[PDB]
Structure 1
Amino acid sequence: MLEGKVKWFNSEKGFGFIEVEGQDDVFVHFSAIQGEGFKTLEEGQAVSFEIVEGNRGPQAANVTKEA
């Protein structure tokens, strides 16, 4: 369990990327980092997730907005 910080989001284009110190840019989509009700985000949004290792490299999967 760690925290990530948006590098930039492209929710409209169907995806957004997070960037975290000690790791690379976590791939993000408004479906995993989402939550109760349809949400959206701006730059500077810090989220919490668990990066794993898959074919395209390390990536978050069940991320969530940091409260």
Structure 2
Amino acid sequence: KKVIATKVLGTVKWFNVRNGYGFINRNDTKEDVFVHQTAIKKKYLRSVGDGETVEFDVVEGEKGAEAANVTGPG
């Protein structure tokens, strides 16, 4: 729950709706961050598309950094 960064922009590398997670590449550091489906703000009410630009917070999850509050840019 510890917030590391906010209003980070990134590109969805892939998001798998069967597994319910994917990875976003941060535009500011070029590092991949894990994104779980429950972290996406609202058929797939919580999903993002491969190649999409998204805005998110980076928080400290159980297994390291992860995306939170994932939305479109702006």
Structure 2: state its 5+ residue gaps: 1-6
> Is 1:4–1:46's contact at 8 Å kept on the other side of the alignment?
yes
Higher fraction of strand: 2
Structure 1: state its 5+ residue gaps: none
Q: 2:52 aligns with which of 45, 48, 67?
A: 45
CA-based RMSD: 2.3
Runs of 4+ in 1 over 3 A off after TM superposition: none
Distance change (3 Å), C-alpha of 1:12 and 1:4: same
SS of equivalent residue, structure 1 residue 66: coil
Q: 2:66 aligns with which of 49, 59, 62?
A: 59
CA distance in 2, matches of 1:65, 1:17: 15
* 1:1-67 pair list within 5 angstroms: 1-21=7-27, 22-35=29-42, 38-66=45-73
TM-score, length-normalised on structure 2?
Answer: 0.66
TM-score, length-normalised on structure 1?
Answer: 0.71
Percent identity for Structure 1 against Structure 2: 44
SS of equivalent residue, structure 1 residue 63: strand
Count of residue correspondences: 66
Higher fraction of helix: 2
